[PDB]
Design a protein around this motif. Structure first.
Motif, PDB file in Angstrom:
ATOM      1  N   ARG B  58     -60.668 -49.346 -25.564  1.00  0.00           N
ATOM      2  CA  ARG B  58     -59.794 -48.182 -25.436  1.00  0.00           C
ATOM      3  C   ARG B  58     -59.615 -47.455 -26.763  1.00  0.00           C
ATOM      4  NH1 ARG B  58     -54.845 -47.377 -27.255  1.00  0.00           N
ATOM      5  NH2 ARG B  58     -54.438 -49.591 -27.686  1.00  0.00           N
ATOM      6  N   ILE B  59     -59.417 -48.206 -27.849  1.00  0.00           N
ATOM      7  CA  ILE B  59     -59.140 -47.606 -29.150  1.00  0.00           C
ATOM      8  C   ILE B  59     -60.340 -46.799 -29.641  1.00  0.00           C
ATOM      9  CG2 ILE B  59     -58.848 -48.244 -31.592  1.00  0.00           C
ATOM     10  CD1 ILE B  59     -56.778 -50.281 -30.758  1.00  0.00           C
ATOM     11  N   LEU B  60     -61.556 -47.296 -29.402  1.00  0.00           N
ATOM     12  CA  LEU B  60     -62.743 -46.586 -29.867  1.00  0.00           C
ATOM     13  C   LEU B  60     -63.016 -45.346 -29.028  1.00  0.00           C
ATOM     14  CD1 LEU B  60     -65.071 -49.499 -30.679  1.00  0.00           C
ATOM     15  CD2 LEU B  60     -63.583 -48.245 -32.210  1.00  0.00           C
ATOM     16  N   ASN B  61     -62.766 -45.425 -27.722  1.00  0.00           N
ATOM     17  CA  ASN B  61     -62.845 -44.230 -26.892  1.00  0.00           C
ATOM     18  C   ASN B  61     -61.812 -43.206 -27.326  1.00  0.00           C
ATOM     19  OD1 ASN B  61     -64.556 -46.035 -25.640  1.00  0.00           O
ATOM     20  ND2 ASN B  61     -64.015 -45.354 -23.573  1.00  0.00           N
ATOM     21  N   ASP B  62     -60.627 -43.667 -27.702  1.00  0.00           N
ATOM     22  CA  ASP B  62     -59.595 -42.728 -28.118  1.00  0.00           C
ATOM     23  C   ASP B  62     -59.892 -42.116 -29.478  1.00  0.00           C
ATOM     24  OD1 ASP B  62     -57.826 -42.164 -26.155  1.00  0.00           O
ATOM     25  OD2 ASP B  62     -56.833 -44.153 -26.328  1.00  0.00           O
ATOM     26  N   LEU B  63     -60.480 -42.896 -30.389  1.00  0.00           N
ATOM     27  CA  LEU B  63     -60.822 -42.349 -31.694  1.00  0.00           C
ATOM     28  C   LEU B  63     -61.973 -41.359 -31.585  1.00  0.00           C
ATOM     29  CD1 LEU B  63     -60.241 -45.246 -34.165  1.00  0.00           C
ATOM     30  CD2 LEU B  63     -58.988 -43.150 -33.864  1.00  0.00           C
ATOM     31  N   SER B  64     -62.928 -41.633 -30.694  1.00  0.00           N
ATOM     32  CA  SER B  64     -64.052 -40.723 -30.505  1.00  0.00           C
ATOM     33  C   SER B  64     -63.585 -39.378 -29.970  1.00  0.00           C
ATOM     34  CB  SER B  64     -65.077 -41.358 -29.573  1.00  0.00           C
ATOM     35  OG  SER B  64     -65.423 -42.659 -30.027  1.00  0.00           O
ATOM     36  N   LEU B  65     -62.591 -39.381 -29.080  1.00  0.00           N
ATOM     37  CA  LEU B  65     -61.979 -38.124 -28.648  1.00  0.00           C
ATOM     38  C   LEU B  65     -61.186 -37.472 -29.762  1.00  0.00           C
ATOM     39  CD1 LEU B  65     -60.952 -39.577 -25.321  1.00  0.00           C
ATOM     40  CD2 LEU B  65     -61.362 -37.083 -25.448  1.00  0.00           C
ATOM     41  N   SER B  66     -60.388 -38.272 -30.479  1.00  0.00           N
ATOM     42  CA  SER B  66     -59.499 -37.727 -31.496  1.00  0.00           C
ATOM     43  C   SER B  66     -60.283 -37.070 -32.616  1.00  0.00           C
ATOM     44  CB  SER B  66     -58.613 -38.828 -32.063  1.00  0.00           C
ATOM     45  OG  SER B  66     -57.825 -39.398 -31.047  1.00  0.00           O
ATOM     46  N   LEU B  67     -61.351 -37.730 -33.081  1.00  0.00           N
ATOM     47  CA  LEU B  67     -62.148 -37.159 -34.157  1.00  0.00           C
ATOM     48  C   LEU B  67     -63.016 -36.011 -33.669  1.00  0.00           C
ATOM     49  CD1 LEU B  67     -62.879 -40.250 -36.349  1.00  0.00           C
ATOM     50  CD2 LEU B  67     -61.483 -38.309 -36.794  1.00  0.00           C
ATOM     51  N   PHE B  74     -54.495 -36.550 -37.474  1.00  0.00           N
ATOM     52  CA  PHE B  74     -54.458 -37.887 -38.060  1.00  0.00           C
ATOM     53  C   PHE B  74     -53.214 -38.664 -37.699  1.00  0.00           C
ATOM     54  CE2 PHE B  74     -57.618 -35.951 -40.689  1.00  0.00           C
ATOM     55  CZ  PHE B  74     -58.547 -36.971 -40.753  1.00  0.00           C
ATOM     56  N   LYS B  75     -52.170 -37.993 -37.206  1.00  0.00           N
ATOM     57  CA  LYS B  75     -51.049 -38.708 -36.607  1.00  0.00           C
ATOM     58  C   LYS B  75     -51.503 -39.513 -35.387  1.00  0.00           C
ATOM     59  CE  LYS B  75     -48.777 -34.250 -37.684  1.00  0.00           C
ATOM     60  NZ  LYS B  75     -47.785 -33.185 -37.363  1.00  0.00           N
ATOM     61  N   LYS B  76     -52.569 -39.066 -34.720  1.00  0.00           N
ATOM     62  CA  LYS B  76     -53.152 -39.752 -33.579  1.00  0.00           C
ATOM     63  C   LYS B  76     -54.380 -40.585 -33.942  1.00  0.00           C
ATOM     64  CE  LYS B  76     -54.556 -40.405 -29.112  1.00  0.00           C
ATOM     65  NZ  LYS B  76     -55.850 -41.091 -28.718  1.00  0.00           N
ATOM     66  N   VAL B  77     -55.020 -40.330 -35.085  1.00  0.00           N
ATOM     67  CA  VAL B  77     -56.179 -41.126 -35.482  1.00  0.00           C
ATOM     68  C   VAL B  77     -55.738 -42.400 -36.181  1.00  0.00           C
ATOM     69  CG1 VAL B  77     -58.126 -41.188 -37.059  1.00  0.00           C
ATOM     70  CG2 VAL B  77     -57.786 -39.211 -35.596  1.00  0.00           C
ATOM     71  N   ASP B  78     -54.814 -42.257 -37.130  1.00  0.00           N
ATOM     72  CA  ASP B  78     -54.417 -43.350 -38.015  1.00  0.00           C
ATOM     73  C   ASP B  78     -53.829 -44.579 -37.304  1.00  0.00           C
ATOM     74  OD1 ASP B  78     -54.015 -44.705 -40.416  1.00  0.00           O
ATOM     75  OD2 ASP B  78     -52.468 -43.300 -41.148  1.00  0.00           O
ATOM     76  N   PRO B  79     -52.862 -44.476 -36.374  1.00  0.00           N
ATOM     77  CA  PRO B  79     -52.299 -45.707 -35.786  1.00  0.00           C
ATOM     78  C   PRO B  79     -53.264 -46.500 -34.926  1.00  0.00           C
ATOM     79  CG  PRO B  79     -50.828 -43.859 -35.495  1.00  0.00           C
ATOM     80  CD  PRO B  79     -52.149 -43.307 -35.839  1.00  0.00           C
ATOM     81  N   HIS B  80     -54.309 -45.863 -34.385  1.00  0.00           N
ATOM     82  CA  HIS B  80     -55.371 -46.597 -33.700  1.00  0.00           C
ATOM     83  C   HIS B  80     -56.130 -47.490 -34.659  1.00  0.00           C
ATOM     84  CE1 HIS B  80     -55.090 -44.957 -29.741  1.00  0.00           C
ATOM     85  NE2 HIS B  80     -55.291 -43.711 -30.134  1.00  0.00           N
ATOM     86  N   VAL B  81     -56.546 -46.921 -35.796  1.00  0.00           N
ATOM     87  CA  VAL B  81     -57.296 -47.678 -36.791  1.00  0.00           C
ATOM     88  C   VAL B  81     -56.448 -48.822 -37.305  1.00  0.00           C
ATOM     89  CG1 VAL B  81     -58.558 -47.520 -38.933  1.00  0.00           C
ATOM     90  CG2 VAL B  81     -58.469 -45.551 -37.411  1.00  0.00           C
ATOM     91  N   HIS B  82     -55.146 -48.578 -37.449  1.00  0.00           N
ATOM     92  CA  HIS B  82     -54.256 -49.620 -37.935  1.00  0.00           C
ATOM     93  C   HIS B  82     -54.139 -50.759 -36.933  1.00  0.00           C
ATOM     94  CE1 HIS B  82     -51.380 -51.418 -40.542  1.00  0.00           C
ATOM     95  NE2 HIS B  82     -50.463 -51.467 -39.589  1.00  0.00           N
ATOM     96  N   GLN B  83     -54.052 -50.437 -35.634  1.00  0.00           N
ATOM     97  CA  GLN B  83     -53.970 -51.498 -34.635  1.00  0.00           C
ATOM     98  C   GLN B  83     -55.251 -52.292 -34.594  1.00  0.00           C
ATOM     99  OE1 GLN B  83     -51.706 -51.146 -31.203  1.00  0.00           O
ATOM    100  NE2 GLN B  83     -53.136 -52.215 -29.836  1.00  0.00           N
ATOM    101  N   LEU B  84     -56.395 -51.610 -34.654  1.00  0.00           N
ATOM    102  CA  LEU B  84     -57.669 -52.316 -34.630  1.00  0.00           C
ATOM    103  C   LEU B  84     -57.859 -53.216 -35.845  1.00  0.00           C
ATOM    104  CD1 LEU B  84     -60.114 -52.844 -33.062  1.00  0.00           C
ATOM    105  CD2 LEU B  84     -61.233 -50.882 -34.127  1.00  0.00           C
ATOM    106  N   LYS B  85     -57.292 -52.855 -37.012  1.00  0.00           N
ATOM    107  CA  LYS B  85     -57.368 -53.754 -38.161  1.00  0.00           C
ATOM    108  C   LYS B  85     -56.656 -55.060 -37.861  1.00  0.00           C
ATOM    109  CE  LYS B  85     -55.702 -55.337 -42.498  1.00  0.00           C
ATOM    110  NZ  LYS B  85     -55.103 -56.509 -41.741  1.00  0.00           N
ATOM    111  N   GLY B  86     -55.400 -54.989 -37.418  1.00  0.00           N
ATOM    112  CA  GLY B  86     -54.690 -56.207 -37.048  1.00  0.00           C
ATOM    113  C   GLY B  86     -55.274 -56.923 -35.835  1.00  0.00           C
ATOM    114  N   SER B  87     -55.706 -56.157 -34.821  1.00  0.00           N
ATOM    115  CA  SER B  87     -56.427 -56.673 -33.658  1.00  0.00           C
ATOM    116  C   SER B  87     -57.578 -57.557 -34.092  1.00  0.00           C
ATOM    117  CB  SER B  87     -56.968 -55.482 -32.854  1.00  0.00           C
ATOM    118  OG  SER B  87     -57.191 -55.732 -31.491  1.00  0.00           O
ATOM    119  N   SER B  88     -58.512 -56.973 -34.838  1.00  0.00           N
ATOM    120  CA  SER B  88     -59.703 -57.708 -35.231  1.00  0.00           C
ATOM    121  C   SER B  88     -59.388 -58.777 -36.266  1.00  0.00           C
ATOM    122  CB  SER B  88     -60.748 -56.744 -35.752  1.00  0.00           C
ATOM    123  OG  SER B  88     -60.208 -55.972 -36.806  1.00  0.00           O
ATOM    124  N   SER B  89     -58.444 -58.516 -37.181  1.00  0.00           N
ATOM    125  CA  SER B  89     -58.111 -59.532 -38.178  1.00  0.00           C
ATOM    126  C   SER B  89     -57.480 -60.757 -37.540  1.00  0.00           C
ATOM    127  CB  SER B  89     -57.189 -58.976 -39.271  1.00  0.00           C
ATOM    128  OG  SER B  89     -55.876 -58.693 -38.801  1.00  0.00           O
TER     129      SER B  89
END
Lengths: 182, 153
Positions: B58-67, B74-89
């Protein structure tokens, strides 16, 4: 025992499992206004809240204010941001400790400390306004956390109507977090 | 039917898991997940990993739309990337975690050209770890389908 508020479902599902192996009852939540109404209910009996800074329906720091300061409860900040700026924002918004994602299993054993310090006290709350707390953390960090003692912490805040046993039990509550700073 | 074939499958699964750590694809956080899986929680690693896939798909589909927006928000791009960092970490997908850290460096600079290259690297690291973890789970199910068993301390 522990309400956990995190919009990251994977981190939530892992952290529930980790807390369960440490023998906590665990309730999940992913909206800050949802966690607030859950905590609002009578006899709910939650011992500790772990909450993410990133929350989709509220400033997760304002959520720390509501659970840490308006309610007399131990809230533990949680974030995948490591920076000293974010950690300081936990204390200055009412959180009592912090956990960095990915959550260390060792770091979870250290949170049992905060409920037992809580249980030393149905009897009246003492509520700190967010600004009065923010000058409490201003006074102790200007004093040096080792050096800061209830007499001078009150003498630096200079708040008329603030007593020393307000400061004495507030030092009791936030000693652990403020020592970890510096 | 060979007993000997189940013996090979056990070694190949063993050696494969070892290779995921030694190649840097998974860090010790994944080993922590396997250590939360016991007789009473027998599918825990599979269930966490599957949830990480759904949320990150979901996050990558949302980032592909957002970008792809004509004015990137970036209010909509940044919190996705932040969740995926903690997600994957939190599951141990270390190359994904690190790629998100570089991505966060470019939302913080609001550099859209860099953000497009970052999203391409994050996708590439996610699809890599998704291929490996799915291979890991398929190898285990093959062992059971042969009538075998993974001892699972």
């Amino acid at each position: 025992r522990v309400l956990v508020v995190d919009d990251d479902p994977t981190c939530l599902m892992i952290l529930e499992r980790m807390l369960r192996t440490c023998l906590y009852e665990v309730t999940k939540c992913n909206r800050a206004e949802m966690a607030l109404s859950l905590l609002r209910k009578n006899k709910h009996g939650f011992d500790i809240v772990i909450s993410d800074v990133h929350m989709p329906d509220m400033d997760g720091f304002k959520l720390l204010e509501h659970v840490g300061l308006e309610m007399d409860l131990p809230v533990i900040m949680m974030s995948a941001d490591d920076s000293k700026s974010v950690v300081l924002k936990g204390v200055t918004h009412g959180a009592v400790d912090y956990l960095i994602k990915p959550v260390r299993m060792e770091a979870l054993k250290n949170i049992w400390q905060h409920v037992v310090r809580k249980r030393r006290s149905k009897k009246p709350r003492v509520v700190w306004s967010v600004e009065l707390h923010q000058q409490f953390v201003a006074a102790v960090n200007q004093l040096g956390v080792e050096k800061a003692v209830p007499k001078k912490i009150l003498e630096l805040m200079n708040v008329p109507g603030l007593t020393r046993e307000n400061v004495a039990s507030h030092l009791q509550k936030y000693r652990i977090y403020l020592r970890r700073l510096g | 039917s060979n007993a000997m074939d189940l013996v090979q499958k056990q070694k190949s699964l063993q050696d494969y898991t070892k290779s995921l750590f030694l190649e840097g694809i998974l860090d010790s956080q994944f080993l922590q997940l396997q250590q939360l899986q016991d007789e009473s929680n027998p599918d825990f690693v599979s269930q966490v990993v599957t949830l990480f896939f759904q949320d990150s798909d979901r996050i990558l589909n949302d980032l592909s739309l957002s970008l792809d927006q004509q004015v990137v928000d970036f209010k909509k791009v940044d919190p996705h990337v932040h969740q995926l960092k903690g997600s994957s970490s939190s599951i141990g997908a270390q190359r994904v975690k690190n790629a998100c850290v570089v991505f966060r460096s470019f939302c913080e600079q609001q550099n859209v050209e860099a953000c497009h290259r970052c999203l391409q690297q994050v996708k590439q690291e996610y699809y890599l770890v998704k291929n490996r973890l799915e291979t890991l789970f398929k190898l285990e199910q093959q062992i059971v389908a042969s009538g075998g068993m993974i001892p699972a301390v």
